Amino acid sequence: VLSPADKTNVKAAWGKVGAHAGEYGAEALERMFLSFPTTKTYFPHFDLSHGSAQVKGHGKKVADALTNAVAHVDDMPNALSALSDLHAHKLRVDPVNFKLLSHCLLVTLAAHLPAEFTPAVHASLDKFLASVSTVLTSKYR
Amino acid sequence: VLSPADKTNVKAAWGKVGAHAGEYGAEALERMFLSFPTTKTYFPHFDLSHGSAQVKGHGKKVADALTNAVAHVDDMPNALSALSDLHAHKLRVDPVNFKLLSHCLLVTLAAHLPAEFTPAVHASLDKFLASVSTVLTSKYR
Amino acid sequence: VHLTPEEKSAVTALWGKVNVDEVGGEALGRLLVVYPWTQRFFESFGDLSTPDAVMGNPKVKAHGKKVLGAFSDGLAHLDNLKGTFATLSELHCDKLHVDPENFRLLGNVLVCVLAHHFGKEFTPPVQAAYQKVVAGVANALAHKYH
Amino acid sequence: VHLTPEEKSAVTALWGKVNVDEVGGEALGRLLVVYPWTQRFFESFGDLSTPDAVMGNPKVKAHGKKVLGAFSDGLAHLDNLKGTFATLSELHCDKLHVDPENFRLLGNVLVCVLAHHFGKEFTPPVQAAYQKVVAGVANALAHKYH
Ligand code: HEM
Ligand code: HEM
Ligand code: HEM
């Protein structure tokens, strides 16, 4: 669903991010690969190193995807089905993995946006990534 | 999503059930309450007994809901949001619990429809209950 | 484990049967057909396209008998389930990097496979019993992640 | 547990700080505000309507300090985490019937609470460390279900 409030809470929280958005993707990824190593069996072709121009690169991508999503909030399905197909059908991504990432994403946001990571947003925000994952895994349902 | 095939695989599997549908709900419930006792902290007011005219009763209900769903497959959201609100907002149902039930439901179907519980259906069917849960929990997203 | 002795019988007796040769496959198979993502771990088994390709797949039925084998074992070693699966733990964990979750899935489909084959006799209680083993096994495997 | 000694420090040192009195609440609170269904276990705490009602709720902050307390403990008893939480296990399991899942959630929000309060210093590695404790604690609690 995502109420007219979460969609405001998300948008704001994202807006208050900026160019850093990309840099935050890469960081969220690192957190995940270090925190939940199980998830690494998806990026063998990646040098999950600490400064990997690869991890840093994927971030820029994951970021713009979450943004593409924040922009078409009232309609992410027809937006990410591009990825849904990829993530579902092609890459065969274990769904749980969309939780773990979606977590590090929030832990990351939390560690950079101290002023606005209010519980209100936090919750609002979770739902968002929740709705994103949901869609990214909707091509499983 | 649910392809034009799963929707055929579901419908058939359900059709091949009949009046028993209700009786299958009640049984699925019993399986769940016995298998995953954690789930019982939702029906204190129920006599989770083996013949409970309550468990047997709820079945009839859960059943008709899954049917209401099989009938409005190309549109369960606007059908179950009735329940979504209840299950989400009012009853505060732990989402995992929609997995466990959705499991016993399939274990139950499996133990009564041996001829048609082909892996094809099984999978098709899972997705269905998956899509049901999803919606029933969509009022969480 | 635990299993009321009343629960062992149900497990012990209803298991004595089991088309051991077929069931292992029915599980592993339905697994890779119901929860596709698991196919990521068996690309090296041949065409897993449609389910008819998955089921009749020799490579599968062959792995299934062992998966079931590993249960037979765990079933007669509930006393110490963790350890028995030590190797396997290492193999599915620090070596194959499988998600503890996928272990709840294989045991869940298996339960369905059982729910299937035996049908009516697979009473809710008998299930509640296997549902305990399936987990108790999903955990031993899980072991090597902490 | 395990924790490279390199990992203990990160956990040990970055934890020495912690507004112990506040953080416990920040977790339990955000919990009942982010994952509402958990409120089912604290209706007996007063208005949990809006989050502003949840956060400033004395009953909460009071429970939080203990939740955090139970960690402090588990943190200095990683050697034997299961047992230390024996009572608590019984209390959240065979007595409160909470889903093992909700234990991964409280530790996850907590991690966020930490991710918050310390901000920049909560390096991915430091997280990966807590992420280990949080789990190792979610499991001990879980214990009494098998
Ligand atoms: C938070 C949700 C996520 C978003 C928005 C996201 C977004 C993206 C985007 C846009 C790409 C680049 C696609 C391209 O360049 O064509 C991608 C690829 C991919 N994603 Fe994600 N992703 C998410 C979660 C995940 C998770 C949870 C995993 C792994 C556990 C994962 C695994 C992959 C893999 C392996 C690739 C392909 C890697 C490669 O070959 O470069 N993603 N994702
Ligand atoms: C497979 C999906 C499910 C369907 C289709 C379903 C359907 C229903 C229906 C139609 C009712 C009766 C509503 C009424 O008479 O107004 C109901 C009530 C309820 N459901 Fe479910 N349900 C599902 C899953 C669950 C789960 C997983 C739980 C518990 C773990 C649960 C907990 C409840 C409770 C406690 C009630 C209210 C009980 C009462 O006061 O009588 N349901 N459900
Ligand atoms: C209760 C859970 C499970 C049991 C009982 C089980 C048991 C086993 C056993 C005994 C083997 C045979 C190894 C040998 O002796 O050579 C094996 C191997 C393997 N298992 Fe499982 N397994 C479980 C779940 C799964 C799941 C969920 C996956 C992940 C999708 C999986 C992936 C593998 C793979 C890839 C091998 C390949 C062995 C090889 O490389 O030849 N298993 N498992």
Ligand code: HEM
């Ligand atoms: C890492 C996980 C958790 C820890 C560390 C934890 C720890 C504790 C501790 C130590 C107490 C105080 C008991 C006392 O000394 O009187 C307690 C009580 C309780 N916990 Fe948690 N808990 C955890 C997660 C949760 C979750 C997820 C729920 C479920 C929603 C929950 C529900 C309860 C309830 C209802 C009590 C009430 C005690 C009373 O009746 O007075 N806890 N917990």
